[PDB]
């Protein structure tokens, strides 16, 4: 799964960031392996629309 995500990420070799993305991709892996994170953690774009200044 990390290799498929890395190929999607346009990189030939595995890095911990790709491992983080692979872990966060599956919801069951977030359920079970959510107690452990790996260096420079990441998450899907769950940003809202209230951070930007309103007009």
């Amino acid at each position: 799964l990390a290799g498929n995500a890395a190929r999607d990420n346009k990189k030939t070799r595995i890095i911990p960031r790709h491992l983080q993305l692979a872990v966060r991709n599956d919801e069951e892996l977030n359920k079970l392996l959510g107690k452990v994170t790996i260096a420079q953690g990441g998450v899907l774009p769950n940003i809202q629309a209230v951070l930007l200044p309103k007009k």
């Binding site: 890095i15 790996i38 260096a39 420079q40 953690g41 990441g42 209230v50 951070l51 930007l52």
Partner: protein, 91 residues
């Protein structure tokens, strides 16, 4: 606040450390001596501690920021951290 979200994305891609040798080193060294003097810390271990600390900081600050979105627009407060910590159970 609008370029800040762009900087959020930039630091999201970043995958390297920040303060390993000269700083955090002096920190853990100091605390170590405080408990028991004449202690040392493996370089790989130092890196692992810094990454664990920064990852936990990222998660907890993200939690506090989403709690601060409930207080309207964008502004953090001490009570945000305190409340969140209590809710989770850290406090």
């Amino acid at each position: 606040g609008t370029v800040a979200l762009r900087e959020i994305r930039r630091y999201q891609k970043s995958t390297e450390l920040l303060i390993r040798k000269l700083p955090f080193q002096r920190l853990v060294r100091e605390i170590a001596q405080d408990f028991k003097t004449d202690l040392r810390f493996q370089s790989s271990a130092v890196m692992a501690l810094q990454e664990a600390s920064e990852a936990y900081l990222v998660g907890l600050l993200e939690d506090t920021n989403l709690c601060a979105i409930h207080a309207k627009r964008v502004t953090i407060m001490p009570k945000d951290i305190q409340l969140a910590r209590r809710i989770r159970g850290e406090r």
